[PDB]
Coordinates of N, CA and C in Angstrom, one line a residue:
Chain A
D1 N 112.0 -1.8 4.2 CA 112.3 -2.1 5.6 C 111.7 -3.0 6.4
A2 N 111.7 -2.8 7.5 CA 110.7 -3.1 8.8 C 110.2 -1.7 9.6
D3 N 110.9 -1.2 9.0 CA 110.4 -0.1 10.1 C 110.3 -0.2 12.3
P4 N 111.6 0.1 12.3 CA 111.9 -0.7 13.6 C 111.3 0.3 14.5
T5 N 111.3 2.0 14.5 CA 110.3 2.9 15.5 C 108.9 2.3 15.3
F6 N 108.4 1.2 15.2 CA 106.8 1.1 14.7 C 106.7 0.0 15.8
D7 N 107.9 -1.1 15.7 CA 107.8 -2.7 16.1 C 107.7 -2.2 17.1
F8 N 108.9 -1.6 17.6 CA 109.4 -0.5 19.3 C 108.1 -0.5 20.2
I9 N 107.7 0.5 19.6 CA 105.9 1.3 20.4 C 104.8 0.1 20.5
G10 N 105.4 -1.3 19.2 CA 104.4 -2.8 19.7 C 104.5 -2.9 20.9
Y11 N 105.4 -2.6 22.3 CA 105.8 -3.3 22.9 C 105.5 -1.4 24.4
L12 N 104.9 -1.5 24.0 CA 103.6 -0.6 25.1 C 102.4 -0.3 24.9
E13 N 101.7 -0.4 26.5 CA 100.4 0.1 26.6 C 100.9 1.2 27.6
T14 N 99.1 1.6 27.1 CA 98.6 2.9 28.2 C 98.1 2.4 29.5
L15 N 98.6 3.5 29.9 CA 98.0 3.5 31.7 C 96.7 3.9 31.6
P16 N 95.9 4.5 32.9 CA 94.4 5.1 33.1 C 94.9 6.5 33.6
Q17 N 96.5 7.1 33.4 CA 96.9 8.2 33.6 C 98.1 9.0 33.6
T18 N 98.3 9.8 33.5 CA 99.6 10.1 32.7 C 100.5 10.5 33.5
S19 N 101.1 9.1 34.2 CA 102.1 8.7 35.6 C 102.7 7.0 34.9
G20 N 102.8 6.9 33.9 CA 104.1 5.9 33.4 C 105.4 7.1 33.5
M21 N 106.1 6.4 32.1 CA 107.8 6.9 31.5 C 107.5 8.1 31.9
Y22 N 109.1 8.3 31.7 CA 109.4 9.5 31.2 C 109.7 9.9 29.9
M23 N 109.7 11.0 29.2 CA 110.1 11.2 27.3 C 112.3 12.0 28.2
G24 N 112.6 10.2 28.5 CA 113.7 11.5 28.3 C 114.3 11.7 27.5
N25 N 115.7 11.8 27.8 CA 116.4 12.4 26.4 C 118.7 11.9 26.6
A26 N 118.4 12.2 25.1 CA 119.9 12.1 25.1 C 121.4 11.8 26.2
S27 N 121.3 13.5 26.7 CA 122.0 13.7 27.6 C 122.2 12.7 29.3
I28 N 120.4 12.7 29.3 CA 120.3 11.8 30.8 C 121.4 10.6 30.6
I29 N 122.7 10.8 30.9 CA 123.8 10.0 31.0 C 123.5 8.3 31.3
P30 N 123.7 7.8 33.1 CA 123.8 6.2 32.5 C 121.9 5.8 32.7
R31 N 122.1 5.0 31.5 CA 120.8 5.7 30.7 C 119.4 4.8 31.8
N32 N 118.6 4.4 31.6 CA 117.6 4.4 32.5 C 116.2 3.3 31.9
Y33 N 117.2 2.5 31.3 CA 115.9 1.7 30.5 C 114.4 1.9 30.4
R34 N 114.1 1.2 32.0 CA 112.2 1.8 32.3 C 111.8 3.1 32.9
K35 N 113.0 3.5 32.9 CA 112.2 4.7 33.3 C 111.8 6.2 32.5
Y36 N 113.0 5.7 31.6 CA 112.6 6.9 30.5 C 112.3 6.2 29.1
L37 N 111.3 6.8 29.0 CA 110.6 5.7 26.9 C 112.0 6.8 25.7
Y38 N 112.2 7.1 26.0 CA 113.4 7.6 25.2 C 115.2 6.4 24.9
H39 N 115.2 5.7 26.2 CA 116.4 5.0 26.7 C 116.0 4.3 26.3
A40 N 114.5 3.3 26.7 CA 113.4 1.9 25.9 C 114.4 1.9 24.9
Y41 N 113.6 3.1 23.6 CA 114.0 3.0 22.3 C 115.0 2.7 22.0
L42 N 116.2 3.2 22.8 CA 117.6 3.2 22.4 C 118.5 1.2 22.4
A43 N 117.6 1.1 23.4 CA 118.0 -0.3 24.4 C 117.3 -1.4 22.7
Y44 N 116.2 -1.3 23.2 CA 115.5 -2.0 21.7 C 116.5 -2.1 20.2
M45 N 116.5 -0.4 19.0 CA 116.7 -0.5 17.9 C 118.6 -1.2 18.5
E46 N 119.4 -0.8 19.4 CA 120.0 -1.5 19.5 C 120.4 -2.7 19.9
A47 N 119.1 -2.9 20.8 CA 119.3 -4.3 20.9 C 118.6 -5.4 19.6
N48 N 118.1 -4.8 18.5 CA 117.6 -5.3 17.2 C 118.6 -4.7 16.0
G49 N 119.9 -4.0 16.4 CA 121.1 -4.1 15.2 C 120.6 -3.0 14.2
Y50 N 120.1 -1.9 14.9 CA 120.5 -0.8 14.4 C 120.5 0.4 14.8
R51 N 122.2 1.1 13.8 CA 122.7 2.2 14.8 C 121.9 3.5 14.8
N52 N 121.2 3.5 13.5 CA 120.6 4.8 13.1 C 119.5 4.8 13.8
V53 N 119.2 5.6 14.7 CA 118.1 6.3 15.5 C 117.6 7.4 15.3
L54 N 116.2 6.9 16.1 CA 115.3 8.2 15.4 C 115.4 9.6 16.7
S55 N 115.8 11.3 15.9 CA 116.5 11.1 16.9 C 115.0 11.7 18.1
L56 N 115.8 12.8 19.4 CA 115.2 12.7 20.2 C 113.2 13.5 20.0
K57 N 113.3 15.2 18.8 CA 112.0 15.5 18.5 C 111.6 15.0 17.5
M58 N 112.6 14.1 17.3 CA 111.7 12.9 16.0 C 110.7 12.1 16.3
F59 N 111.4 11.3 17.4 CA 110.7 10.5 18.4 C 109.7 10.8 18.4
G60 N 109.9 12.5 18.9 CA 108.7 12.8 20.2 C 107.7 12.6 19.1
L61 N 108.2 13.3 17.8 CA 106.9 13.5 16.3 C 106.4 12.3 16.5
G62 N 106.5 11.3 15.9 CA 106.2 10.1 15.5 C 105.5 9.6 16.9
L63 N 105.7 9.6 18.1 CA 105.2 8.6 19.1 C 103.3 9.2 18.7
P64 N 103.0 10.5 18.3 CA 101.9 10.1 19.0 C 101.0 9.9 18.0
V65 N 101.6 9.4 16.5 CA 101.1 8.8 15.6 C 101.0 7.9 15.7
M66 N 102.1 7.0 15.4 CA 102.4 5.0 15.7 C 101.5 5.1 17.2
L67 N 100.8 5.9 17.7 CA 100.7 5.2 19.0 C 99.0 4.7 18.9
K68 N 98.3 5.7 17.9 CA 97.7 5.6 17.4 C 96.7 4.6 16.7
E69 N 98.3 4.4 15.1 CA 97.6 3.6 14.8 C 98.4 1.9 15.4
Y70 N 98.0 2.0 16.3 CA 98.4 0.6 17.5 C 96.7 1.0 18.0
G71 N 95.7 1.3 17.4 CA 94.8 2.3 18.6 C 95.3 2.6 20.0
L72 N 96.6 3.5 20.3 CA 96.8 3.9 21.7 C 96.2 4.9 21.9
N73 N 95.8 5.8 22.8 CA 95.9 6.4 23.7 C 97.2 7.4 24.0
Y74 N 97.8 8.7 23.7 CA 99.2 8.8 24.2 C 98.8 10.0 25.0
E75 N 99.1 9.9 25.9 CA 98.8 11.1 26.6 C 100.2 11.7 27.5
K76 N 101.0 13.1 27.8 CA 102.1 14.0 28.0 C 101.6 14.3 29.4
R77 N 102.5 14.8 29.9 CA 102.1 16.4 31.4 C 103.5 16.2 31.6
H78 N 103.6 17.9 31.6 CA 105.1 18.4 32.1 C 104.6 18.0 34.1
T79 N 106.1 17.9 34.4 CA 106.4 18.0 35.3 C 107.9 18.8 35.8
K80 N 107.7 18.5 37.7 CA 109.4 18.5 38.3 C 110.6 18.1 37.3
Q81 N 110.3 16.9 37.1 CA 111.2 15.9 36.2 C 111.3 16.1 35.3
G82 N 110.6 16.3 35.1 CA 110.5 16.3 33.0 C 109.1 15.8 32.4
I83 N 108.7 15.5 31.1 CA 107.0 15.1 30.2 C 107.5 13.9 30.8
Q84 N 105.9 13.3 31.9 CA 105.3 12.1 32.1 C 104.0 11.3 30.8
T85 N 104.7 10.7 31.0 CA 104.0 10.3 29.9 C 103.0 9.1 30.3
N86 N 101.5 8.1 29.6 CA 101.1 7.5 30.8 C 101.4 6.2 28.9
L87 N 102.5 5.9 29.5 CA 102.4 3.9 28.9 C 103.5 4.0 29.8
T88 N 103.4 2.4 29.5 CA 104.5 1.0 29.9 C 105.0 0.8 28.8
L89 N 106.3 0.0 29.7 CA 106.2 -1.2 28.4 C 106.3 -2.9 28.8
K90 N 104.9 -3.4 27.6 CA 104.6 -4.5 28.0 C 105.2 -5.9 28.8
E91 N 105.1 -6.6 28.9 CA 105.6 -7.8 29.5 C 106.7 -8.2 28.4
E92 N 106.7 -8.6 27.2 CA 107.0 -9.2 26.3 C 108.2 -9.0 26.6
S93 N 108.4 -6.7 26.6 CA 109.9 -6.6 26.4 C 111.2 -7.1 27.0
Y94 N 110.3 -7.0 28.6 CA 111.2 -8.1 29.2 C 112.4 -9.1 29.6
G95 N 111.3 -9.9 28.5 CA 112.3 -11.1 27.5 C 113.3 -10.7 26.6
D96 N 111.9 -10.5 25.2 CA 113.0 -10.0 24.1 C 114.2 -9.1 24.4
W97 N 113.9 -7.8 24.5 CA 115.4 -7.4 24.4 C 115.6 -6.0 25.8
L98 N 114.2 -5.9 26.2 CA 114.8 -5.0 28.2 C 116.4 -5.8 29.2
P99 N 117.3 -5.1 28.7 CA 118.7 -5.5 30.0 C 118.2 -5.9 30.2
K100 N 118.8 -7.6 30.8 CA 119.2 -7.1 32.4 C 119.9 -7.4 33.1
Chain B
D1 N 100.6 -5.6 14.2 CA 99.9 -4.4 13.3 C 100.8 -4.9 11.9
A2 N 100.2 -3.8 10.9 CA 100.5 -4.3 9.1 C 101.8 -2.7 9.5
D3 N 101.3 -1.6 9.4 CA 102.2 -1.1 9.4 C 101.9 0.4 8.2
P4 N 100.5 -0.1 7.0 CA 100.9 0.2 5.2 C 101.2 1.7 5.4
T5 N 101.0 3.5 6.2 CA 101.3 4.6 6.5 C 103.0 4.3 5.5
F6 N 103.7 3.1 6.3 CA 104.7 2.8 6.8 C 105.6 2.4 4.7
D7 N 104.1 1.9 4.7 CA 104.7 1.0 3.1 C 104.5 2.2 1.9
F8 N 103.2 2.3 2.4 CA 103.2 3.4 1.3 C 104.8 4.9 1.4
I9 N 104.3 5.3 2.0 CA 106.2 6.5 2.0 C 107.3 5.2 1.1
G10 N 107.0 4.2 1.5 CA 108.4 3.2 0.8 C 108.5 3.7 -0.6
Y11 N 107.1 4.6 -1.4 CA 106.8 4.3 -2.7 C 107.4 5.8 -3.1
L12 N 108.1 6.8 -2.4 CA 108.2 8.0 -2.4 C 109.8 8.3 -2.6
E13 N 109.2 9.9 -3.1 CA 111.3 10.2 -3.7 C 111.1 11.5 -3.3
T14 N 112.5 11.2 -2.9 CA 112.7 13.5 -2.6 C 112.9 13.8 -4.1
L15 N 113.3 15.5 -4.5 CA 113.7 15.7 -5.1 C 114.1 17.0 -5.2
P16 N 115.0 17.2 -5.7 CA 116.0 18.4 -5.2 C 115.9 19.4 -4.8
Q17 N 114.6 19.3 -5.0 CA 113.5 20.5 -4.5 C 112.2 21.4 -4.2
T18 N 111.6 22.4 -3.0 CA 110.4 22.0 -2.8 C 108.6 22.3 -4.3
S19 N 109.4 20.6 -5.4 CA 108.6 21.9 -6.4 C 108.4 19.7 -6.2
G20 N 107.6 19.3 -5.7 CA 107.3 17.9 -6.5 C 105.6 17.8 -5.3
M21 N 104.8 17.5 -4.4 CA 103.1 16.9 -4.7 C 103.1 17.6 -4.2
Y22 N 101.0 18.1 -3.4 CA 100.6 19.3 -3.6 C 100.2 18.1 -1.5
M23 N 100.7 18.6 0.0 CA 100.0 18.4 0.5 C 97.9 18.3 0.6
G24 N 97.5 17.3 0.2 CA 96.3 17.8 -0.5 C 95.3 17.6 1.3
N25 N 94.3 17.5 1.0 CA 93.7 17.7 1.8 C 92.6 16.7 1.8
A26 N 92.0 15.9 3.2 CA 89.7 15.4 2.7 C 89.0 16.2 1.8
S27 N 89.3 17.4 1.8 CA 88.4 18.4 1.1 C 87.9 18.6 -0.3
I28 N 89.1 18.8 -0.9 CA 89.5 18.6 -2.6 C 89.5 17.7 -3.0
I29 N 87.7 17.8 -3.3 CA 86.5 16.6 -4.1 C 87.1 15.7 -5.2
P30 N 86.7 15.9 -6.3 CA 87.3 15.1 -7.1 C 88.8 14.8 -6.6
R31 N 89.3 13.7 -6.1 CA 91.3 13.8 -5.9 C 91.8 13.2 -6.7
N32 N 92.6 13.9 -6.7 CA 94.2 14.5 -7.7 C 95.0 13.2 -7.1
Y33 N 95.4 11.9 -7.3 CA 96.7 11.3 -6.6 C 98.3 10.8 -7.3
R34 N 97.9 11.5 -8.4 CA 99.5 12.1 -8.5 C 99.3 13.5 -7.8
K35 N 98.5 14.5 -8.1 CA 99.4 15.4 -7.4 C 99.0 16.4 -6.2
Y36 N 98.6 15.8 -5.3 CA 98.0 15.3 -4.2 C 98.7 13.9 -3.1
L37 N 99.8 14.6 -1.9 CA 100.3 13.4 -1.4 C 99.7 12.6 -0.9
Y38 N 98.9 13.2 0.1 CA 96.8 13.3 1.3 C 96.1 11.8 0.2
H39 N 95.9 12.2 -1.9 CA 94.8 11.6 -1.9 C 95.6 9.6 -2.3
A40 N 96.8 10.2 -3.2 CA 97.9 9.5 -3.4 C 97.7 8.3 -1.8
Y41 N 98.4 8.9 -1.1 CA 97.8 8.0 0.5 C 96.3 7.2 -0.2
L42 N 95.1 8.5 0.6 CA 94.3 7.7 0.4 C 94.2 5.9 -0.7
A43 N 94.6 6.2 -1.7 CA 95.0 5.3 -3.0 C 95.7 4.6 -3.0
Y44 N 96.4 3.9 -1.9 CA 97.6 3.1 -1.6 C 96.3 2.9 0.0
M45 N 95.8 3.3 0.7 CA 95.2 1.9 1.7 C 94.4 2.0 0.9
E46 N 93.4 2.1 0.7 CA 92.8 1.8 -0.6 C 92.9 0.8 -1.1
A47 N 93.1 1.0 -1.9 CA 93.9 -0.4 -3.2 C 95.0 -1.5 -2.0
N48 N 94.8 -1.5 -1.2 CA 95.3 -2.4 -0.5 C 94.1 -3.2 0.9
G49 N 93.2 -2.9 0.5 CA 92.2 -3.1 1.5 C 92.4 -2.1 3.7
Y50 N 92.3 -1.5 3.3 CA 92.4 -0.4 4.8 C 91.3 -0.1 4.6
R51 N 90.3 0.4 5.6 CA 89.6 1.9 5.6 C 89.5 2.3 5.8
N52 N 90.1 2.0 7.8 CA 90.5 3.9 8.1 C 92.3 3.4 7.5
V53 N 92.0 5.1 7.9 CA 93.4 5.6 7.8 C 93.6 6.5 8.4
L54 N 94.8 7.0 9.0 CA 95.5 8.5 9.4 C 94.8 9.5 8.4
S55 N 94.1 10.4 9.7 CA 93.9 11.9 9.1 C 94.4 12.8 8.5
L56 N 94.2 13.4 8.1 CA 95.4 14.6 7.4 C 96.4 14.8 7.9
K57 N 95.9 15.2 9.5 CA 96.8 15.7 10.8 C 97.6 14.7 11.0
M58 N 97.0 14.1 11.3 CA 98.2 13.1 11.7 C 99.2 12.5 10.3
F59 N 98.2 11.7 9.9 CA 99.9 12.0 8.0 C 100.8 12.7 8.0
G60 N 99.9 14.2 8.5 CA 101.3 15.4 8.0 C 102.6 14.8 8.9
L61 N 102.5 14.6 10.3 CA 103.5 14.2 11.7 C 103.9 13.5 11.3
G62 N 103.5 12.5 10.8 CA 104.3 10.6 10.7 C 105.5 11.2 9.1
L63 N 104.8 11.9 8.5 CA 105.4 12.3 6.7 C 107.3 12.2 7.7
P64 N 107.7 13.0 7.8 CA 108.7 13.2 8.0 C 109.1 12.3 8.8
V65 N 109.0 11.8 10.0 CA 109.6 11.1 10.6 C 109.5 9.6 9.9
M66 N 108.5 9.1 9.2 CA 108.3 7.8 8.5 C 109.8 8.2 7.4
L67 N 109.6 9.0 6.9 CA 110.6 9.9 5.8 C 112.1 9.6 6.3
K68 N 112.7 9.9 7.5 CA 113.5 10.0 8.2 C 113.7 8.4 8.2
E69 N 112.8 7.4 8.6 CA 113.8 5.8 8.8 C 113.5 6.0 7.0
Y70 N 113.1 6.6 5.9 CA 113.8 5.6 5.2 C 115.1 6.4 4.3
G71 N 115.6 7.2 5.3 CA 116.1 8.1 4.5 C 116.7 9.1 3.4
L72 N 115.4 9.5 3.8 CA 114.8 10.8 3.1 C 114.9 11.9 3.8
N73 N 115.4 13.3 3.4 CA 115.2 14.6 3.4 C 113.3 15.0 3.0
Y74 N 113.0 15.3 4.2 CA 111.5 16.2 4.1 C 111.5 17.5 3.5
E75 N 110.5 18.1 2.9 CA 110.7 18.9 2.0 C 109.6 20.5 2.2
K76 N 109.4 20.9 2.6 CA 108.0 21.6 2.6 C 107.6 22.7 1.9
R77 N 107.1 23.8 1.9 CA 107.3 24.8 1.7 C 105.3 25.2 1.3
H78 N 105.0 26.6 1.8 CA 103.9 27.3 1.6 C 103.4 28.1 0.7
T79 N 102.4 27.4 -0.2 CA 102.6 28.7 -1.2 C 101.0 28.3 -2.3
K80 N 100.5 29.6 -2.9 CA 99.1 30.0 -3.2 C 98.2 29.5 -3.5
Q81 N 99.6 27.7 -3.7 CA 98.8 26.8 -4.2 C 98.2 25.7 -2.8
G82 N 99.2 26.4 -1.8 CA 98.7 25.4 -0.7 C 100.1 24.9 0.2
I83 N 100.6 23.5 0.6 CA 101.7 23.1 0.9 C 102.4 22.4 0.5
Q84 N 103.8 22.8 -0.8 CA 103.7 22.6 -1.1 C 105.2 21.0 -1.4
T85 N 105.4 19.9 -1.3 CA 106.6 18.7 -0.7 C 107.8 18.8 -1.9
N86 N 108.6 17.7 -1.6 CA 110.4 17.9 -2.0 C 109.7 16.3 -2.3
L87 N 108.7 16.1 -2.6 CA 108.5 14.7 -3.3 C 107.5 13.8 -3.8
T88 N 107.7 12.8 -5.4 CA 107.4 12.6 -5.7 C 107.2 10.6 -6.1
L89 N 106.1 10.1 -6.5 CA 106.0 8.7 -6.6 C 107.3 8.4 -7.3
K90 N 107.3 7.1 -6.7 CA 108.6 6.2 -7.3 C 107.7 5.5 -8.9
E91 N 108.2 5.4 -9.7 CA 108.1 4.3 -10.6 C 107.0 3.3 -9.8
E92 N 107.8 2.5 -9.2 CA 106.7 0.8 -8.7 C 105.3 1.3 -8.7
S93 N 105.1 2.7 -8.4 CA 103.3 2.7 -7.6 C 102.3 3.0 -8.8
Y94 N 103.5 2.6 -9.9 CA 102.2 2.9 -11.1 C 101.5 1.6 -11.4
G95 N 102.1 1.0 -11.6 CA 101.8 -0.4 -12.3 C 101.1 -1.2 -10.0
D96 N 101.6 -0.6 -9.4 CA 100.9 -1.1 -7.8 C 100.5 -1.2 -7.2
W97 N 99.4 0.2 -7.2 CA 97.9 0.7 -7.5 C 97.5 2.6 -7.1
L98 N 98.6 3.0 -8.0 CA 98.0 4.2 -8.9 C 96.3 4.0 -9.7
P99 N 96.1 4.2 -8.9 CA 94.8 3.9 -10.1 C 94.7 4.7 -12.5
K100 N 94.4 3.6 -13.1 CA 94.3 3.9 -14.0 C 93.1 5.1 -14.7

């Protein structure tokens, strides 16, 4: 395989503070690829031809690990609108797979 | 990036029951590549030229997820001898990297 989940994490950058994307979830309907990390994730997998995607729970667990693998420091924070991370999409994401 | 940890997980097979390798730890001295999953892990990384390896804790968290990525179902269990998994090294392990 190629380990798509890992590649996706390759399009992520860390912020000086826990104010980046939100770890959305499958229920939030009108998807928001720019606001929810999980939605961004689905967008990528789908863009790369994978029908099989990690669950929010599984994705959640892996996140910290794979980020460390890329040498980044994951940071979450509980909020009125949910869990917010300190992550944002690198610019290449916009041309590569982010829906237009 | 390369993502070797994922590759290593490619050398793993699941057993009908939680009776495979043990999730050793860095403390257990004379290593035992065939007995402890973690030791097996170090062996692989080393065999592939990586000096920086995931800690037991990080490795532990990733395991379930990467396995799922390979379509396998991770199973652990606490025992008189520590945590035992339902995993074993595939055959190619033996010729590829498992120390002689």
